[PDB]
Design a protein around this ligand. Structure first.
Ligand SMILES: O=c1ccn([C@@H]2O[C@H](COP(=O)(O)OP(=O)(O)O)[C@@H](O)[C@H]2O)c(=O)[nH]1
Ligand SMILES: O=c1ccn([C@@H]2O[C@H](COP(=O)(O)OP(=O)(O)O)[C@@H](O)[C@H]2O)c(=O)[nH]1
Ligand SMILES: [Mg+2]
Ligand SMILES: [Mg+2]
Lengths: 804, 804
């Protein structure tokens, strides 16, 4: 018998006893149910409220329907889809905005048709695998259209209408199989060059500058006369070049996109929030792609139209995921000839694309090319030391390293922007190895492959060069200048260099380990293999020298400056005087200051993020810079005081003047003169701070419908077990990666410490400095020879290309 | 005019254009709607499927209803609640299990009554604030009941029925206002002692042992004869003590509770999953509380019944949150006289509760007491060095520190288990300051208060002692022995000591800073204030000495051992011989090994969690232990070789033999003899490893119903803005806490380094060692005097308490 539970929910507190022995007898619950009339009032109120539907309710029901369909429960999905479709169809009449009314009507009809198809599938009449709502792209007039704009010729359908479609494709390789198409393919156009602009959390100005620069490049390509020896022929000839270029702007996530960037994109007719909100309600799309042929006008001059596809991903991922989508989906569908990759904010000169295409067409053996990277407005605000140091570093790195590596046809491209490939060398295995992380969990790959983060460009380069049964070489184009924007403070530079150094070190180790594939698998000429062997020996020596850089810097400074002051080896001054306390005071001050600075740096770097420790980083950098400037002045005095000899002048030239000689040979000598002083004061800061922080922060890295009660309990237990197992797996992965990074850091730090201690204790300045001079002179001589060879090639092969 | 969109969802790919200029004309959409018949088939299939309801659907609808009600949308909540109630009422008939049928019927009726009340509230007839479903507790027969069990007397309602209720109370202070009651209050019983057992991720064995020990304590309290001078009187007298004790088992979260623990709890009639799943569907409770009077039988002996309340929190929180719930809700409702707190696994002896209650009743000035903490089975498995070291540490800490601090009536209770208070001293301000973190966000409090993590017990102790207009002192009971289980490896010890050291250091700083409140605000006797001033001076000296412990240890070892070997100061051997290379080799080996070990330790501690670095920690600990054992042997030889004098023997006694003297005075001398050797080998490990890791890881720490389209857009924009602001706030908080911890670590490390360097360079062994000996002898003499005073008090106040 049921107890007196008539008022158990209404009253604030009720205590009841429920006997579970033999259940409640029938004919008693019915009387209690029929004896209550307030339920009728509640039902009447609910029905009256539920007569009128709403947009928000319909969208929520469609979202729940998509969630149910993703869980492979089809009856609930069908019911929710029917409810949402009927709700939207009823609501569409009430709306006063014509655009909203039309979009709601179309969405309701589409949802109802999908419901009918799903019902047919459930009944068994239609046999398919993993049914999804049919793909449907909607074209709408652009809100803002410039009446006064002059272009070559634009069909009204292409000129005034922007197209939108949501894509659910989980693996981008299936983009063309699921039935998705692009406007270029439908219209019959077959673009031959594709440019990708990865964007994440950026202001409108950078995107505007990038688009203007691309339009200028297209105009320059159009302007060139035909029939010249240096003019390109074919698709990129003239008066139709804009039809052979497609620009893909891939964003990283709706959550992190700057709102002003979205406003600017909507201004140029490449984004609309109402269409995205309505048309993507039930699909549960992974990405949303808008398509347009944007027409940009700057000041009183009208630019050429640019065919643009803006792909906005729903959830945030890495840049490698953006390249995954771009390459696989768009490249496999369009099947272009070339493929250029650049970041947002990279401003190109008028001739970058022309030079890239000219090299690709003339050589026919180049599988990839990279342009020169420069700092925007270096001379302006020259009082900033960080900007000038970065400018000097970029110029020297480009000239020496790029020339030397491009002589042998193998380039380890610097991170960031403006690298072009041809979609024949990279289509197969190189791209499969490029996207290895995105397809295989880091548990299977291991710690070494996982820690190769943000170094995927070097992996792609090495895969292209060492591809089996093919001989593809890389090239460096000096005239394809791309200007970027660099951080103006030490903290951003520290973070950027952390990323760069992690990637560079582990990619270099991978290349050194796998260099044998060039001889074992690739098909090159014998001379190419011998040249690659020579470059391999040079690369081993260079990496080994770079690993021991802090110890060598400390030893050089200590010996020269301070054991010249203490032991009377400075030539311009005599220290045979003095009380023997000042000399030891200087040596001890140097040692203690260096040790304390290194300890503070390592503690801070391993400890916390370098944004709230700005003052300490600035203080350590200033101390090291003053020390380096004093050492430079002392060394200059020592060198000038000596009457000099053949050995002295040869070593001085091959050590210091190689930079000036190469810069003068290439014509970029004024930048070196302006920025050498600024770069000199940051060498210890660069080496110590960046390497220590990079090593310390290495850890940073990425179906029952109804059921009964027993089914519910089993489902909940299974869910809890799966959640706990996943948590344990993630913990184990983090533990392994942290252990690997700690082992690497300990090895590096203790190797450097032991080397420095042994050289200090068991070696003199007379028996160590000549070895360092020989090593540095040899490396710089090799780099200078490489630069001269590249210059000779680039200025001669045009004249001597007739014979061979 | 609408385009040909008849087949847009069914077909795989359809491209359509939607003109937004002037909307679609009427009389055309109606024809298309009425021209489609597949929608009728889909509707028929959906209706046929939806005729039959299910348990899972009803539970999901009720959960969604609770979610809607929490968002203050009442129409949707009413509609979902009605649907769920009707679904459950329809389903309840189909079930075959009588318990499930009865529970479903009761839940359906309760939900329908709540729907009626909510409808009345919406219509305006009933005026309330924040309506919620009415509180309803359900009593069910226990699944397993022991027929053969003999007890004092048990009403069948109390003996066979277990009660359950879900609580939604967001702020536990409102527990009694919302209408919740406990079975003890309803039955008329008024328990005078409450015991809290906090549990999180523990095996059944620990809980079983704790419950058995509590039952043994109750039996011992019952057994004592009346009329004796030492026997308690009143509630705890005899034959009814079990009615005056309530045990609250507070779990930390359903997700992290060990499944075997839940099985054991269900075995003893304190948990049931079906009742929890059904009765908590729509409430959205914060916690679930089960109530029973459990009857435990071990072997052939039957234990006394224990009144138990098991409170299981839905989501995981800190132990401070469990104490928040326990203290506020249960203590404020029941209003007990005492309040004991212990962890799970703490096994009490037969006389712990008797001694605690005896002290509380006899003294009448004690506001809090703590029992002795011991290691379970210390002699067993004596080959383990960590267990013996922990046993020695516990014994020495208890004796010396607890006796000295309890002489002055102010105890800084060690973390973990078995502390009792009286619910008159702590009811007001002390508990408000105890729960300060749980009520105020860490942004307002600042970094210093936030970093005082896991130190709340010391805060409560100091608040009790320094409470305004009151004179409450603390006490240490030696005979209330509680045995715990200690980690058997170095990694668990490292983590445990990290928590303990963070809490202890910041609580000590807080107490030192706020010590003035005792004189400014409290109301003590003049003699008490003078004694507190003396203890304050001693505490300052002890903390200052403890801050510089690594440097002093290094200096002592270096000077004595190695500058005895190098400079011929070992008395049992002569080093005037030797080549002058072995001596410097020994000194350099010591310095380099110590520096490398410290560098490795700090890098590992700041770097990664100490579970995958087990081998390196073990290696460093072994090296330090061998060094300490060698130093101990050398020091023993040096001391024995000297013929000795008054100063030597006095310093030796007051430095080393204080431990043995105090242990022999208190009778616990054999433990010291057994474990002194094991503890000696871990002193450098303790100091260096635990302090470094603790400092390094200091960072670780804790409404529109319908709307239109514009409303939806505004709502989504507001949600995105709020999410981004919250993310920024969390980032700023993390940055501030990390900066504070890094500053503290840098200050500590560099202070120790500079002190050691200056003492090494500018001081000799003759001018430094006597100062260290004086300091250590003074501290140990003060501790010995405190221990002797406590022993005299505990053995005399019984005899001399008649006069005063
Ligand atoms: O998680 C991210 C971070 C950045 N980027 C984009 O990838 C490029 C490189 O990012 P970043 O500016 O950080 O490069 P860096 O300046 O550090 O060399 C830029 O276009 C970013 O917008 C991205 O797609 N995902
Ligand atoms: O997040 C937590 C961790 C622990 N505990 C409980 O609080 C007590 C102290 O935990 P622990 O065993 O970690 O203490 P320790 O052994 O570290 O001193 C034990 O009863 C735990 O079950 C808790 O309530 N919440
Ligand atoms: Mg950039
Ligand atoms: Mg414990």
């Amino acid at each position: 018998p049921p107890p007196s539970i008539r008022s158990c929910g209404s009253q604030q507190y009720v205590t009841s006893y429920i006997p579970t022995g033999a259940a409640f007898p029938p004919s008693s619950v019915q009387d209690m149910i029929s004896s209550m009339k307030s339920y009728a009032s509640a039902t009447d109120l609910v029905r009256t409220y539920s007569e009128i539907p709403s947009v928000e309710e319909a969208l929520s029901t469609l979202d729940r329907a998509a969630a149910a369909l993703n869980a492979r429960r089809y009856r609930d999905a069908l019911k929710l889809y029917l409810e949402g479709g009927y709700a939207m169809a009823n609501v569409a009449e009430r709306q006063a905005n014509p655009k909203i009314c039309n979009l709601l009507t179309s969405k309701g009809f589409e949802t109802l048709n999908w419901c009918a198809r799903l019902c047919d599938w459930i009944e068994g009449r239609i046999k398919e695998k993993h049914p999804r709502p049919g793909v449907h792209k909607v074209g709408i007039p652009v809100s803002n259209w410039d009446e006064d704009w002059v272009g070559p010729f634009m069909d009204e359908e292409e000129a005034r209408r922007m197209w939108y479609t949501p894509v659910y494709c989980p693996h981008p390789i299936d983009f063309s199989n699921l039935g998705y198409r692009l406007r270029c393919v439908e219209t019959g156009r077959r673009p031959r060059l594709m440019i990708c602009i990865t964007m994440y959390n950026e202001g409108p100005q950078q995107l505007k500058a990038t688009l203007k620069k691309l339009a200028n490049n297209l105009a320059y390509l159009k302007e060139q006369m035909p029939g010249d020896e240096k003019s390109l022929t074919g698709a990129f000839a003239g008066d139709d070049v804009w039809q052979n270029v497609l620009v893909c702007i891939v964003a990283d996530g709706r959550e992190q996109v700057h709102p002003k960037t979205l406003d600017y994109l909507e201004a140029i007719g490449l984004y609309d929030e109402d269409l995205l909100t309505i048309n993507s309600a039930g699909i549960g799309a992974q990405c949303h792609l808008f398509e347009h042929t944007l027409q940009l006008s700057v000041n009183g001059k009208c630019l050429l139209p640019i065919q643009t596809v803006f792909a906005l991903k729903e959830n945030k991922a890495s840049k490698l995921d953006s390249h995954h989508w771009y390459f696989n989906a768009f490249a496999e569908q369009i099947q272009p000839e070339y493929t250029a990759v650049m970041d947002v904010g990279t401003m190109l000169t008028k001739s970058a694309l022309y030079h890239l295409l000219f090299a690709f067409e003339r050589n026919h053996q180049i599988g990839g090319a990279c342009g020169q990277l420069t700092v925007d407005n270096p001379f302006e605000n020259l009082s900033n030391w960080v900007i000038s140091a970065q400018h000097f570093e970029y110029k020297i790195s480009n000239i020496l390293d790029k020339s030397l590596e491009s002589c042998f046809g193998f380039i380890s491209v610097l991170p960031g922007a403006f690298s072009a490939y041809r979609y024949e060398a990279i289509r197969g295995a190189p791209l499969d190895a490029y996207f290895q992380t995105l397809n295989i969990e880091l548990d299977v790959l291991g710690p070494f492959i996982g820690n190769m983060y943000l170094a995927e460009d070097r992996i792609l380069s090495f895969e292209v060069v060492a591809r089996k049964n093919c001989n593809w070489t890389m090239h460096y184009v000096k005239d394809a200048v791309a200007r970027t924007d660099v951080p103006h403070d030490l903290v951003g530079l520290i973070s950027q260099r952390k990323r760069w150094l992690n990637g560079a070190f582990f990619a270099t180790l991978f290349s050194i380990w796998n260099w044998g594939r060039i001889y074992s698998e690739s098909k090159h000429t014998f001379v190419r293999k011998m040249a690659f062997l020579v470059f391999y020996v040079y690369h081993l020596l260079y990496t080994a020298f770079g690993f021991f850089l802090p110890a060598n810097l400390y030893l050089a400074l200590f010996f020269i400056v301070f054991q010249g002051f203490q032991q009377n080896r400075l030539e311009f001054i005599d220290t045979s005087e003095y009380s023997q306390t000042v000399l030891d005071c200087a040596v001890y001050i140097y040692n203690f200051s260096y040790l304390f600075g290194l300890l503070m740096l390592i503690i801070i770097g391993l400890g916390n993020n370098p944004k709230h420790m700005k003052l300490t980083y600035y203080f350590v950098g200033a101390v090291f810079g003053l020390m380096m400037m004093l050492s430079s002045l002392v060394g200059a005095g020592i060198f000038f005081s000596t009457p000099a000899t053949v050995h002295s002048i040869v070593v001085s030239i091959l050590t210091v003047g190689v930079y000036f000689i190469a810069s003068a040979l290439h014509g970029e000598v004024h930048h070196i003169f302006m920025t050498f002083t600024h770069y000199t004061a940051l060498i210890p800061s660069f080496v110590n701070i960046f390497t220590i922080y990079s090593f310390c922060n290495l850890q940073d890295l990425s179906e029952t419908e109804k059921g009964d009660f027993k089914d519910v309990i089993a489902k909940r237990r299974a869910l809890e077990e799966l959640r706990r197992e996943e948590k344990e797996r993630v913990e184990n992965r983090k533990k392994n990666f942290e252990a690997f990074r700690t082992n690497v850091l300990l090895t590096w730090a203790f190797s450097n410490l032991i080397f420095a201690l042994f050289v200090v204790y068991f070696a003199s300045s007379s028996t160590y400095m000549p070895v360092l001079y020989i090593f540095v002179a040899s490396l710089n001589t090799c780099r200078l020879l490489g630069s001269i060879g590249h210059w000779v090639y680039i200025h001669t092969e045009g004249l001597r290309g007739r014979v061979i």
